[PDB]
Symmetry: C3
Subunit: 314 residues, 3 copies
Amino acid sequence: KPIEIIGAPFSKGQPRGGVEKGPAALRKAGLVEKLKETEYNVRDHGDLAFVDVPNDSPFQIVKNPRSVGKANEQLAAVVAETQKNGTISVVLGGDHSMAIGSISGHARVHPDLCVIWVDAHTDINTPLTTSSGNLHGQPVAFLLKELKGKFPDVPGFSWVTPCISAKDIVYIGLRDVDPGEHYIIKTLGIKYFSMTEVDKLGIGKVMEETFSYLLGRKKRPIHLSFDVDGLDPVFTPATGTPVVGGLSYREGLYITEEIYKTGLLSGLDIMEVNPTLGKTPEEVTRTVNTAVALTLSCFGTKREGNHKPETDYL
Amino acid sequence: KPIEIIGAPFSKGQPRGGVEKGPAALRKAGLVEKLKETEYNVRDHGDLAFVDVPNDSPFQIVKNPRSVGKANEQLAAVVAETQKNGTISVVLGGDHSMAIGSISGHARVHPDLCVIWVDAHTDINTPLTTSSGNLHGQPVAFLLKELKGKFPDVPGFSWVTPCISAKDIVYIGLRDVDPGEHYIIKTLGIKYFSMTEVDKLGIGKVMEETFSYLLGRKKRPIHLSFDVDGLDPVFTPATGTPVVGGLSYREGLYITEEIYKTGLLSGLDIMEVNPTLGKTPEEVTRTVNTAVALTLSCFGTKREGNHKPETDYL
Amino acid sequence: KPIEIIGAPFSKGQPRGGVEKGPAALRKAGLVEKLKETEYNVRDHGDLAFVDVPNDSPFQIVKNPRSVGKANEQLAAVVAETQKNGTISVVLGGDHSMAIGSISGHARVHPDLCVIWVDAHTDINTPLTTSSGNLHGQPVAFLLKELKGKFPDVPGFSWVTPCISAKDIVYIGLRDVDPGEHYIIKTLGIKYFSMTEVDKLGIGKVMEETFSYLLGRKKRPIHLSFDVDGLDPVFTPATGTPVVGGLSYREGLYITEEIYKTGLLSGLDIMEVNPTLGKTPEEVTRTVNTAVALTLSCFGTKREGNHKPETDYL
Ligand SMILES: N=C(NO)NCC[C@H](N)C(=O)O
Ligand SMILES: N=C(NO)NCC[C@H](N)C(=O)O
Ligand SMILES: N=C(NO)NCC[C@H](N)C(=O)O
Ligand SMILES: [Mn+2]
Ligand SMILES: [Mn+2]
Ligand SMILES: [Mn+2]
Ligand SMILES: [Mn+2]
Ligand SMILES: [Mn+2]
Ligand SMILES: [Mn+2]
């Protein structure tokens, strides 16, 4: 199987500068090289270039909607492209509002796909709920069908087609939800696992269920949108919104791990890493690394070890 | 439902200066304000004043028994008072020996109450076991009936009436128990969950059981005495006795959380926060915050999120 | 029952200087004294002296094989000696390659013994796999029968007799396995619990199983080889190879704890503590302490508490 890496150095999703430097550090950590050492065929598509929409007017509170509309449109296309050739897309953020792109494009080639959203936040606000224009906190809105038209068309997103329903998505790691978002997720009966659930059930059962719940009947393709703020701030401190009492580096790898074992990975998102937001170098480095290790996890590497088949090490 | 906050800035329970500054910081963190933002009616009773008993003689080893007898007597009264009006009492320590007060008063209005003691220590020593006069390490002795008279009457506590039996209390978080205490807890067949049990069962099951065990038959009122030393020292470092390998910030919120969901909260204790014992500002701040968040937890706030009913955020 | 402590201040197993200072600090922390306070009879055999083999030639890549062959031979003997008298041997490292000794000697008196290897690493490389001469990363090779002769006889180890099979050993804590090692452990169908398994099952079940798996039929004696690098680097930072996302101080004590409860402890290994590798004093101190506490755990001390029988503390 093949693997194509895509950098989406973008940041117009939220107000903190750095996230675009994201994929830069991830590579500078040897993400590619390592990925190669695995049983997967890897290719680097380099980092997209995002033309800046002059005079981007703040559609209501929602900010820079046009810049975020073309960047996401351009991406989705690139994704659908590789998705076509049969390769697995590994998007590198860049803030999380690049999910709109990454997922839509993916959907094209596989509209039967299910999404697993490991994030501290739900990002399911619509332009009608947000308390900030930060689109990086709305992606699920532009993708959910049950929320189509539920808000004024947004400048630059016209190109998006709600590709998934509240029954094909699952949240893992939620711990800082806005009133509005809570309403919508309860109303649209979405399946999640907030820290309290993980706390209760145990990352073990969480996956166990999230799987049968999404792959009980027909086994579909999986799109893993991993928000690095989703692990606890001790483990991935360099982010836009640290939020305490989150997923642990272990549970983080327990998830990427069970997903790899299902053999249904098709698209991955390593978003929100902000190489500029580290209180000390080490912190940025911790972040980047646990981020990298999460990826390679998705593609093989088991904490128990890996031995290349057929060869007799004895 | 209503909520009345009471500060018990006291410290004669143990030898370290600061605990009295406790409720000061908790408020200075916005404990009140936040509490208001919830669905509960909150009122601040201000902080009690504790007249100092001149020439407080150390009844045997037990120290400052008289100062600790009037402070606790005065408190219990104030508690029973609000307990009468039907409001939920939220005592802010101040060391943990203020439990004698807080609980006794509460008992008055509801003598059917059950107590959940989240603490690293059991504090069940009698004046006959302690290796220190530190009363903050004996509270359960003055409240347990099965231990009534089992020790020489103490100067200043004469006013206390053993209000609960070893079958209405449950410990969660024990990890540093004195020989004597261990004897007594085993002898009086008390129900606990030491770190090893939590370790084994999982905070999930722990509550699950502690509940049925205390509310299997008749559903009574709950008194949550939370000792901030009870979470691990990483999470609530600013305390009298850090003790490693304790409850985690998550499990800490998983507990306050399931208790809120039972709808049986009647009295709460946020004890031992010592704003002076932080190796660095941050530490004191971590402490205070996780302390505050534990409270608001008890009163509503879920890590999944909260949306005010009736309103359509869409 | 009796307890004899043995120091194996050795370091030729790996390239980092300090590990030999190991048992020195462990004692200097009061390991002995504390052990005495327990219900066990303790005796200090002092620290062995390890004659240095002049001109130790690096058998292929494998380094200092002769120094490591006599130190391990001398040890095994001392162990078998006390094992004979019926006492429980508590070896203090010194690097982990002293397992070859400690276990072999033990095997002598009880060849039916089972081994529980709490380590981050498997150390099951043969002189034919290692990428370093570091013998401290091969011990299981010289002890496994299914690996006997599978590699060129090594200078100084000729005296060792493969004493256990891949069905009497169990790994707990694995998280940094070399290709070769992974091959061998899979091939020889060994029973392990990598961090991912612990992650999934929960230290609770892990033991539960490892026990029945090793003591389902016939209850044998247990040899606990505990590698301090096995807990996460936050908790036991002063080591040769920190490796993130490992066993926690709690799970660490949950293990030593359930092993004590089986009453089948016969030999213990507190290896790899390097009092020189601490980024700050505190770190070395954390290490040593959690190391000490792990031991006393093995011999009684429960986090719930301990009361000397027959005595009425009331
Ligand atoms: N960092 C994130 N998401 O990844 N924050 C989301 C917060 C909020 N819901 C918003 O739209 O601003
Ligand atoms: N910090 C506490 N309790 O909250 N310590 C209790 C220790 C001991 N049992 C005593 O009475 O001194
Ligand atoms: N610290 C350890 N083991 O305890 N490292 C083992 C690493 C490697 N397998 C080796 O032989 O070098
Ligand atoms: Mn997000
Ligand atoms: Mn987020
Ligand atoms: Mn206490
Ligand atoms: Mn305590
Ligand atoms: Mn080892
Ligand atoms: Mn190791």
